[PDB]
Each structure stands twice: as structure tokens, then as C-alpha cells.
């Protein structure tokens, strides 16, 4: 199972190894082909999606056209959000992706109340924190 792949997420760097693992029991796998839009919004409560093997060509709405690569994650829906969100991204290649519904991550958070409060803070504290790294984006 996806032990390292959910742990590849930049928020999970600091996670409890039981919380990250209890999430894996109901995960789903899906593939896309080159040029195909993997994520666009239109309704409330959309999922998380994360890259098992492949590349995406991607937009951040504040920012640039990018690529993103394997081990990465996307879909900017906060678990505590209200309403629909904005992102726009497509498969660069024949890409192997994985997904979990947001509400079932909200279910497993309640088994680990230390991690649950660590989400009740970022639910407002994140506003000016925009995507910054601790030191560098190097292995």
C-alpha cells in the first residue's frame, strides 16, 4: 500500500505514523492519458488527488504555468472549507494517480485528535504562508 506516497505530502512530514497509515485502508487508484484535465471545479466537497508515477502540466491561479512530478499532491480543497475551489491542471503524460475523498480524511483525523487541532489552526492561519519551504526543495 501507499505508505510512502501519502507520506510524500509536505504536510505529512511531521505526521503521526499511525494516522498516516489508518488513512490508507480505502484509497483508490486512477490513470489519465496525455493532455487530459485531471482536476476542475463545479461542486462542493471535491477530493484530494496525488501522483504515484508521472508528470502534470499545471497552473497555479496566483502564479505560473508549472509542471508537477511523482510523489507530489494537488487539489487545493481544505478539509474544513465551505463551497467550491479553484485549480486547473492536466496530465503531461500517461500518468498513474491516486485519490481519497476529503470527508474520509476528516473521518480518520478524529482517531488522532492531536492532528485534528493541527488542522483547526491552518483552517485560518495559512493566508500569508503561500507555499513556502522550511529550507530548500532538495532530497
Swiss-Prot record:
UniProt PTM: Phosphorylation at Ser-135 by PRKG2 shifts the voltage-dependence to more negative voltages, hence counteracting the stimulatory effect of cGMP on gating. S-palmitoylated.
Record remark: domains: The segment S4 is the voltage-sensor and is characterized by a series of positively charged amino acids at every third position. The ion-conducting pore region is between segment S5 and S6.
Residues found modified as Phosphoserine: 135
Tissue: Highly expressed throughout the brain. Detected at low levels in heart.
Subunit structure: Homotetramer. The channel is composed of a homo- or heterotetrameric complex of pore-forming subunits. Heterotetramer with HCN1. Forms an obligate 4:4 complex with accessory subunit PEX5L. Interacts with KCNE2.
Noted disease: Epilepsy, idiopathic generalized 17: A form of idiopathic generalized epilepsy, a disorder characterized by recurring generalized seizures in the absence of detectable brain lesions and/or metabolic abnormalities. Generalized seizures arise diffusely and simultaneously from both hemispheres of the brain. Seizure types include juvenile myoclonic seizures, absence seizures, and generalized tonic-clonic seizures. Both autosomal dominant and autosomal recessive EIG17 inheritance have been reported. Febrile seizures, familial, 2: Seizures associated with febrile episodes in childhood without any evidence of intracranial infection or defined pathologic or traumatic cause. It is a common condition, affecting 2-5% of children aged 3 months to 5 years. The majority are simple febrile seizures (generally defined as generalized onset, single seizures with a duration of less than 30 minutes). Complex febrile seizures are characterized by focal onset, duration greater than 30 minutes, and/or more than one seizure in a 24 hour period.
Family: Belongs to the potassium channel HCN family.
Binding site for 3',5'-cyclic AMP: 66, 75-78, 85-86, 126
Localization (cell): Cell membrane
Origin: domain of life: Eukaryota
Name of the protein this chain belongs to: Potassium/sodium hyperpolarization-activated cyclic nucleotide-gated channel 2
Residues of the full protein shown: 534 to 672 of 889
Function: Hyperpolarization-activated ion channel that is permeable to sodium and potassium ions. Displays lower selectivity for K(+) over Na(+) ions. Contributes to the native pacemaker currents in heart (If) and in neurons (Ih). Can also transport ammonium in the distal nephron. Involved in the initiation of neuropathic pain in sensory neurons.
Amino acid at each position: 500500500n501507499c505508505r510512502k506516497l501519502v507520506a510524500s505530502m509536505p504536510l505529512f512530514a511531521n505526521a503521526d505514523p499511525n494516522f498516516v497509515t489508518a488513512m490508507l485502508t480505502k484509497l483508490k487508484f486512477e490513470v489519465f492519458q496525455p493532455g487530459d484535465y485531471i482536476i476542475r471545479e463545479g461542486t462542493i466537497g471535491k477530493k484530494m488527488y496525488f501522483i504515484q508515477h508521472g508528470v502534470v502540466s499545471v497552473l497555479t491561479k496566483g502564479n505560473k504555468e508549472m509542471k508537477l512530478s511523482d510523489g507530489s499532491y494537488f487539489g487545493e480543497i481544505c478539509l474544513l472549507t465551505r463551497g467550491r475551489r479553484t485549480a486547473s491542471v492536466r496530465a503531461d503524460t500517461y500518468c498513474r494517480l491516486y485519490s481519497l475523498s476529503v470527508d474520509n480524511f476528516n473521518e480518520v483525523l478524529e482517531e488522532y485528535p492531536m492532528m485534528r487541532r493541527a488542522f483547526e489552526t491552518v483552517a485560518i492561519d495559512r493566508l500569508d504562508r503561500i507555499g513556502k519551504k522550511n529550507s530548500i526543495l532538495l532530497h
